[PDB]
Structure 1
């Protein structure tokens, strides 16, 4: 049973309600960071930064941010210190997000998939374990060090 913080604007609102319902029925614990109602003009960043911030402050938790394409949403979540948000557009990329990138969050576009395709992406995200492989941890540590100092590391040749 995984804890999952969810964020969404209007474009990903309806899909977010289906995912919250799906996560409850599969033994997980969804927490809604907003939007709590449909509002056609609302802005995605605040909801994505809310979910990503709360995910980082609650180790072991995961996160899902929803928009039209999911791309503005993953960009916003990646600005949060300590957060790593992949865009999942398939079962494979959702699983590789966990296995290789140790991503605590994923973006998904509600306008890009059917309900059944989006829920299969969510399943792979919340069940695929992080591999802990040496090369993957090494890359995560290099990026985290850049996030600490904002001093770009030298390219290897």
Structure 2
């Protein structure tokens, strides 16, 4: 059972609703960060920042941000200190996001998949373990040190 913070603008709103329901039915704990209603003009960043911020502050939790393509949404989430947000467009990329990147969040594009395909991506994301392999942690640590100082690490 995993706690999952969800965020979405209008383009991901309907898919967010379905994911919340799906996560409840599969034994997880969805927390809705908004949008709470459909508003065709609303702006994704605030919802994605909210989901990623809450995810980072609640270790062990995951997050999912939803939009049209998911790309604006993952970009926004990645601006949050300590957040790692992959774009999941397949079961394989969702699983690898966890296994290799230890991503706490994924973005999904609601306009890119059927509901069936989106829920399978979610399933892979919420069940795949972080591998803890040395090279993966080393790379996470390098990026984290860059995030701390914004001093670009030298290339070999």
Q: TM-score, normalised by structure 1?
A: 0.99
Partner of 1:117: 117
* Aligned residue-pair number: 156
Q: So what's the TM-score if we normalise by structure 2?
A: 1.00
**Distance (Å, rounded) in 2 between the aligned partners of 1:100 and 1:111:** 26
Q: How far is 1:55 from its partner?
A: 0.1
> How much has 1:84 moved relative to structure 2?
0.1
Write the distance in 1 (CA, Å) between the matches of 2:146 and 2:17.
36
Cα shift at 1:92: 0.1
Distance 1:66 1:24 in 2: 18
CA RMSD of aligned residues (A): 0.2
Distance (Å, rounded) in 1 between the aligned partners of 2:79 and 2:140: 15
Unaligned runs of 5+ in 2: none
Q: Secondary structure at the match of 2:81?
A: coil
Deviations 1:29-70 (A, max 9, x none): 000000000000000000000000000000000000000000
- DSSP-derived class of the 1:40 partner: coil
Deviation of 1:105 after TM superposition, in Å, equals 0.1
SS at 1:39 equivalent: coil
Deviations 1:47-103 (A, max 9, x none): 000000000000000000000000000000000000000000000000000000000
Deviation at 1:24, TM superposition (A): 0.2
Deviation at 1:3, TM superposition (A): 0.1
Q: Which runs of 4+ in 1 moved over 3 A?
A: none
- SS in structure 1 of the partner of residue 146 of structure 2: helix
